[PDB]
Design a protein around this nucleic acid. Structure first.
Lengths: 129, 208, 226, 82, 126, 65
RNA sequence: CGGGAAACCAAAGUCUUUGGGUUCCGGGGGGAGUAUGGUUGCAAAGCUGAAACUUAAAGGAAUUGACGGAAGGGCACCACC
RNA sequence: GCUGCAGUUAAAAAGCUCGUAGUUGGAUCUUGGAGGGUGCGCCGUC
């Protein structure tokens, strides 16, 4: 069955972009999916998206450009300690310079750069570049 | 429209097309061709969109102009129904030829005696002419093509839906292309009609 | 030097532009993705002052009617020191030919490398923009950007290829049967070549681009023959 | 690809597909674009002045290059009701 | 059989015939003289063997076009033959007979035409 | 600016400069990363006693010292 | 497309760009499913399961000959008729 | 072999399923303007 819903949305995306696709319909969506789709959006890795309202759990249409090499999800959502964030981005990001680790902290779902600036930390959601 | 008016449909042409039985289309659609399809006739057969067949043909024509050296557009057919057809196209527009057994190593392979470096290939059956369509994709050359409803779309950018089951459908479409290209960047002038009878394109064949 | 230059004559329009001093850098070819079939083209545009190192010799064989056969296989790598490299394997009757052909093969294959900054981009790129990996029949090489002074941390054979490519500093990790040298070098070759394929945010924006020297030079590249 | 003092380094900036916005990289010679002529309106008279699109090896091997051209040609004309 | 002409011979025959058809003949004796005029052949046995096979060809050509040989005269002959066209065959005779739907094909194509209806029955696969 | 990075970085630099091993623009960390062995080796006695006549050999120098 | 050493594989794909859930077994080959204790069995046997010692390849896949009392094969009085 | 292994054929998915512990669990409840750090010659950049 389902343990997580994010992992499906992310994968669906990745296969869309790999095909050469410019849109996807993910299902079923969640506040966390929105928040993650949103961080991606702010940065350029996707275009605009749209939450369609079935009387159920939702369905999202993402319009994607093609700046996206990969958006992954980290499971389980490990706790990170401010100097485990430095260790994570190195593990899974292309160059020190770019790509984001996106985690969930007490003060919001955020990319790790925003994390560093706020100076808060938490549990790791996923990534992209 | 687009480029602005006259260039639209002309009953005169929609008449030659319907006459030549182009739009008739294959019973097996194929997925990448679904757009061309107007409607499915009862007793299985599909009606191609001549309007669409038209406009793409013009789009093709335009891409053939813009190649500066007309010789280096290669019109190609191993199919019989398209052999006199392409020979004629090459006579009018610059356009060098490749009929019959394409001969493998013609695009890749300097050494060979049919070595050609076209800047544009136009093919008549993507299934029969698969070799040229493959070789072309080994060396960055764009492709116009003859496609019925169930033809390979791989490595062909620009299709002009036809009928290619045959008759004059293959004749007319090569005719109209040459007619179109001579109009554009040529010198027919006055996207007015033909001193050339389209039959001149069209397959020959046998003798008793 | 004086030995009497040959008389290259070109099969290919791309070649004519090159000899004519119409095409001056490989970049034109690379941007256009023109295929290169005449080795001299590579030779004229670069390669001049590009050094070729022979990586391996190992012999093989297959069975005849009346028993055996055996022959020499040479692995050659070519590259300046900056940003260009190629790799060629050949097997031939004689070592000299095997090497001579291998070099030709390597040159045809010459590939772009995108070299980048570990992070603070001062005084020009020392390493790689991102991390790129390549696989060849179960060997896989991963290149990782590294800080200055790190150098090429790779096996000797790989270090040699990366060196010619013109990479200063890079971390590597290799998995698979590293022993089978032809495979390992091939994967690393794929790895480096992949750098151009990476799209970074720097690259995000587009472009009238180019008309292609083939088109502009078109007359030029139909001489007076046939 | 800036350097220290806003300088432009490494060695080239590749063209990007007209359909997928993905780098044409650099030795993939199973890919090409397509110069469409501009017309001096009115009609005929090829006048330059290319309208041009570049299509990736990928799209073409997946049995697109064509349509992509049409989204491309109509969206920017010519081509209408496609 | 035992005498199967080899390429060096067979080639020369195709060769001469291509550039010599109106000169050459039906008869061994004369081409043999002709090969002296139109070709330089080193031994007499070869030249004979050539003259001979090319004659066997000429004998065949002069009874039906042969699989891989072309000469200016044969091209001209095919050219003229490849003209034919009668009263002409379609007509098709007053009135096309349609299969209907093909009738509905015109009916919903905005197109007048001649007519006839006989289109019914389904319709097995295989 | 990170008290740890500031306090120790500046110190490493100042130490590296007192010995001449390092220079100012270097004299930031971004430059030590792009440095080498000669730069140290150049500061030993032996090569200096050459470097101002008072030896005329890296040789002479070491036996002198 | 993509995977795999390939044979192959629309799953053996989405695996160095390595992270959807869970469960099980393997770490060179032989000694060995053997010894020994436990357990189940009327019995035959089953489950769990070592070591000492032995040894540098065991093995997989593809490629090619050689060779066949495998199939279509041919050719020659150095073969038969 | 957490990070970071392999198990169709190489050493390795129990004949199959039920099933407690253990592990694992769908969507959904709040919505430019200036202050301070270091670079570049009174101006600004981040």
């Amino acid at each position: 069955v389902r343990m997580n819903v994010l992992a499906d949305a992310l994968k669906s995306i990745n296969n869309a972009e790999k095909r050469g696709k410019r849109q996807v319909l993910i299902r079923p969506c969640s506040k966390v999916i929105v928040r993650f789709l949103t961080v991606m959006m702010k940065h350029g890795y996707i275009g605009e998206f749209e939450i369609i309202d079935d009387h159920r759990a939702g369905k999202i249409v993402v319009n994607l450009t093609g700046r996206l090499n990969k958006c992954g999800v980290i499971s389980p959502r490990f706790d990170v300690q401010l100097k485990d964030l430095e260790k994570w981005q190195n593990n899974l990001l292309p160059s020190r310079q770019f790509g984001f680790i996106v985690l969930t902290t007490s003060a919001g779902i955020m990319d790790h750069e925003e994390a560093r600036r706020k100076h808060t930390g938490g549990k790791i959601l996923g990534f992209f570049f | 429209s687009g480029a602005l008016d006259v260039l639209q449909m002309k009953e005169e042409d929609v008449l030659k097309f319907l006459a030549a039985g182009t739009h008739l289309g294959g019973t097996n659609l194929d997925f990448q061709m679904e757009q061309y399809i107007y409607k499915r006739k009862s007793d299985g057969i599909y009606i191609i969109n001549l309007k669409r067949t038209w406009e793409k043909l013009l789009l093709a024509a335009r891409a053939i102009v813009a190649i500066e050296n007309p010789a280096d557009v290669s019109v190609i057919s191993s199919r019989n129904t398209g052999q006199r057809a392409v020979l004629k196209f090459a006579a009018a527009t610059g356009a060098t030829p490749i009929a019959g057994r394409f001969t493998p190593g013609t695009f890749t392979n300097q050494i060979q005696a049919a070595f050609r470096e076209p800047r544009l290939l136009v093919v008549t059956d993507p299934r029969a002419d698969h070799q040229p369509l493959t070789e072309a994709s080994y060396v960055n050359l764009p492709t116009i093509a003859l496609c019925n409803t169930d033809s390979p779309l791989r490595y062909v950018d620009i299709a002009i839906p036809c009928n290619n089951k045959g008759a004059h459908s293959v004749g007319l479409m090569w005719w109209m292309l040459a007619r179109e290209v001579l109009r554009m960047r040529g010198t027919i002038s006055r996207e007015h009609p033909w001193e050339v009878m389209p039959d001149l394109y069209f397959y020959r064949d046998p003798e008793e | 030097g004086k030995a009497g230059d040959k008389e290259w004559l070109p099969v290919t329009k791309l070649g004519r532009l090159v000899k004519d001093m119409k095409i001056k850098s490989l970049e034109e070819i690379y941007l256009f993705s023109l295929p290169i079939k005449e080795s001299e083209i590579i030779d004229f545009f670069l390669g001049a002052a590009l050094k070729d190192k022979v990586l391996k010799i190992m012999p093989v064989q297959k069975q005849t009617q009346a028993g055996q056969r055996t022959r020499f296989k040479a692995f050659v790598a070519i590259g300046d020191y900056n940003g260009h490299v190629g790799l060629g394997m050949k097997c031939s009757k004689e070592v000299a030919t095997a090497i001579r052909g291998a070099i030709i093969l390597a040159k045809l294959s010459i590939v772009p490398v995108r070299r980048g900054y570990w992070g603070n981009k001062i005084g020009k790129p020392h390493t790689v923009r991102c991390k790129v990996t390549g696989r060849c029949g179960s060997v896989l090489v991963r290149l990782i950007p590294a800080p200055r002074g790190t150098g090429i941390i790779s096996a000797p054979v790989p270090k040699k290829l990366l060196l010619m490519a013109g990479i200063d500093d890079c971390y590597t990790s290799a998995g698979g049967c590293t022993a089978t040298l032809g495979n390992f070098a091939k994967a690393t070759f794929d790895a480096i070549s992949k750098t151009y394929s990476y799209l970074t945010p720097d690259l995000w924006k587009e472009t009238v681009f180019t008309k292609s020297p083939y088109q502009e030079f078109t007359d030029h590249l139909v001489k007076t023959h046939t | 690809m800036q350097s220290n003092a806003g300088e432009f380094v490494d060695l080239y900036v590749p063209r990007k597909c007209s359909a997928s916005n993905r780098i044409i990289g650099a030795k993939d010679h199973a890919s090409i674009p397509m110069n469409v002529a501009e017309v001096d309106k009115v009609t005929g008279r090829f006048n330059g002045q290319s309208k041009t699109y570049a299509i990736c090896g990928a799209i073409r091997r997946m049995g697109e290059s064509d349509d992509s051209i049409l989204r491309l040609a109509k969206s920017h004309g010519i081509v209408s009701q496609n | 059989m035992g005498r199967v002409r080899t390429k060096t011979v067979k080639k020369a025959a195709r060769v001469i015939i291509e550039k010599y058809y109106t000169r050459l003949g039906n008869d061994f004796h004369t081409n043999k003289r002709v090969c002296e005029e139109i070709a330089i052949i080193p031994s007499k046995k070869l030249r004979n063997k050539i003259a001979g096979y090319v004659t066997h060809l000429m004998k065949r050509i002069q009874r039906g076009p042969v699989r891989g040989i072309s000469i200016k005269l044969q091209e001209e002959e095919r050219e003229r033959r490849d003209n034919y066209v009668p009263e002409v065959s379609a007509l098709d005779q007053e009135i096309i007979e349609v299969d209907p739907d093909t009738k509905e094909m015109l009916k919903l194509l905005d197109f007048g035409s001649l007519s006839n209806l006989q289109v019914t029955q389904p319709t097995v696969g295989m | 600016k990170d008290p740890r990075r500031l306090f120790e970085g500046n110190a490493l630099l100042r130490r590296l400069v007192r010995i001449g091993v390092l220079d100012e623009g270097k004299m930031k960390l971004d430059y030590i990363l792009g440095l080498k062995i000669e730069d140290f080796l150049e500061r030993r006695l032996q090569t200096q006693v050459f470097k101002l006549g008072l030896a005329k050999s890296i040789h002479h120098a070491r036996v002198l010292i």
